Design a protein around this motif. Structure first.
Motif, PDB file in Angstrom:
ATOM      1  N   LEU A  50       0.793  -1.244   0.000  1.00 28.77           N
ATOM      2  CA  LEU A  50       0.000   0.000   0.000  1.00 28.77           C
ATOM      3  C   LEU A  50       0.828   1.300   0.000  1.00 28.77           C
ATOM      4  CD1 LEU A  50      -0.163   1.354   3.079  1.00 28.77           C
ATOM      5  CD2 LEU A  50      -1.638  -0.554   3.505  1.00 28.77           C
ATOM      6  N   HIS A  51       2.144   1.220   0.240  1.00 24.20           N
ATOM      7  CA  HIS A  51       3.074   2.358   0.144  1.00 24.20           C
ATOM      8  C   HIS A  51       4.137   2.203  -0.945  1.00 24.20           C
ATOM      9  CE1 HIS A  51       1.941   5.612   2.761  1.00 24.20           C
ATOM     10  NE2 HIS A  51       1.772   4.794   3.818  1.00 24.20           N
TER      11      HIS A  51
ATOM     12  N   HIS B 213       0.756   1.044  -4.428  1.00 26.11           N
ATOM     13  CA  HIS B 213      -0.366   1.997  -4.455  1.00 26.11           C
ATOM     14  C   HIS B 213       0.070   3.471  -4.547  1.00 26.11           C
ATOM     15  CE1 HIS B 213      -4.756   1.126  -4.156  1.00 26.11           C
ATOM     16  NE2 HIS B 213      -4.717   2.466  -4.311  1.00 26.11           N
ATOM     17  N   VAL B 214       1.368   3.743  -4.372  1.00 25.17           N
ATOM     18  CA  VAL B 214       1.989   5.086  -4.432  1.00 25.17           C
ATOM     19  C   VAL B 214       3.178   5.105  -5.419  1.00 25.17           C
ATOM     20  CG1 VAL B 214       2.517   7.106  -2.917  1.00 25.17           C
ATOM     21  CG2 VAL B 214       1.380   5.180  -1.927  1.00 25.17           C
TER      22      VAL B 214
ATOM     23  N   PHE C 290      -0.050   2.629  -9.125  1.00 27.14           N
ATOM     24  CA  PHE C 290      -1.451   2.966  -8.780  1.00 27.14           C
ATOM     25  C   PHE C 290      -1.990   1.967  -7.736  1.00 27.14           C
ATOM     26  CE2 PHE C 290      -6.002   1.803 -10.200  1.00 27.14           C
ATOM     27  CZ  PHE C 290      -6.638   2.705  -9.325  1.00 27.14           C
ATOM     28  N   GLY C 291      -1.504   0.719  -7.756  1.00 16.44           N
ATOM     29  CA  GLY C 291      -1.951  -0.357  -6.851  1.00 16.44           C
ATOM     30  C   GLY C 291      -2.362  -1.615  -7.616  1.00 16.44           C
ATOM     31  N   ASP C 292      -1.386  -2.358  -8.153  1.00 19.92           N
ATOM     32  CA  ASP C 292      -1.571  -3.635  -8.869  1.00 19.92           C
ATOM     33  C   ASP C 292      -2.645  -3.598  -9.981  1.00 19.92           C
ATOM     34  OD1 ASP C 292      -0.564  -6.193  -9.420  1.00 19.92           O
ATOM     35  OD2 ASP C 292      -1.365  -7.135  -7.587  1.00 19.92           O
ATOM     36  N   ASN C 293      -2.641  -2.508 -10.754  1.00 19.89           N
ATOM     37  CA  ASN C 293      -3.638  -2.258 -11.798  1.00 19.89           C
ATOM     38  C   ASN C 293      -3.097  -1.376 -12.940  1.00 19.89           C
ATOM     39  OD1 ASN C 293      -6.366  -3.494 -11.515  1.00 19.89           O
ATOM     40  ND2 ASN C 293      -7.234  -1.548 -11.787  1.00 19.89           N
ATOM     41  N   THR C 294      -2.319  -0.333 -12.616  1.00 15.36           N
ATOM     42  CA  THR C 294      -1.710   0.665 -13.515  1.00 15.36           C
ATOM     43  C   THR C 294      -2.703   1.432 -14.406  1.00 15.36           C
ATOM     44  OG1 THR C 294       0.339  -0.498 -13.296  1.00 15.36           O
ATOM     45  CG2 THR C 294       0.264   1.101 -15.090  1.00 15.36           C
TER      46      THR C 294
END
Length: 153
Positions: A42-43, A46-47, A50-54
């Motif tokens: 999450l750091h 996600h930062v 974007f968080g395992d999606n792009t």
């Protein structure tokens, strides 16, 4: 024998084996080894992307959407009007011209409702930037700080 070295060599706290193993007994490294690790994602992800999606898991739709692969640059120009709109503008002259020649009239709703969604980039993204900090600061949304007495209505 002597009472000076028999403390440091006789009172030796080797019982601490049972208190080392009491902390490992149920294996809290297995329950908590997840909790510390989800905090790294999450750091660090996600930062960072974007968080395992792009753009949408990995493909977003056809293979990559215009928000990662650098299709043009702005994304909303090259594949909006540049080589998309220009194909219907020159082949039909109503698909693009119906939004352009009407934009003069539709400005009455685009500059009102589109000032939330079309201008979202600074109106709603910042939660203030185009609904209190710009175009609305003087009264048209700042009805609290510039509208204390409501006299614009």
């Amino acid at each position: 024998a002597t009472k000076a070295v028999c403390v440091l060599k006789g009172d030796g706290p080797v019982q601490g084996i049972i208190n080392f193993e009491q902390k490992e007994s149920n294996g809290p490294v297995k329950v908590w080894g997840s909790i510390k690790g989800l905090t790294e994602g999450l750091h660090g992800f996600h930062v960072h992307e974007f968080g395992d999606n792009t753009a949408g898991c990995t493909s977003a739709g056809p293979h990559f959407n215009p928000l990662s692969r650098k299709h043009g640059g702005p994304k909303d120009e090259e594949r909006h009007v540049g080589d998309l709109g220009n194909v219907t503008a020159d082949k039909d002259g109503v698909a693009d011209v119906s939004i352009e020649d009407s934009v003069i009239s539709l400005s009455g709703d685009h500059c009102i409702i589109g000032r939330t969604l079309v201008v979202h980039e600074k109106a709603d993204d910042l939660g203030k930037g185009g609904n209190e900090e710009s175009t609305k600061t003087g009264n048209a949304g700042s009805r609290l700080a510039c509208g204390v007495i409501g006299i614009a209505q």
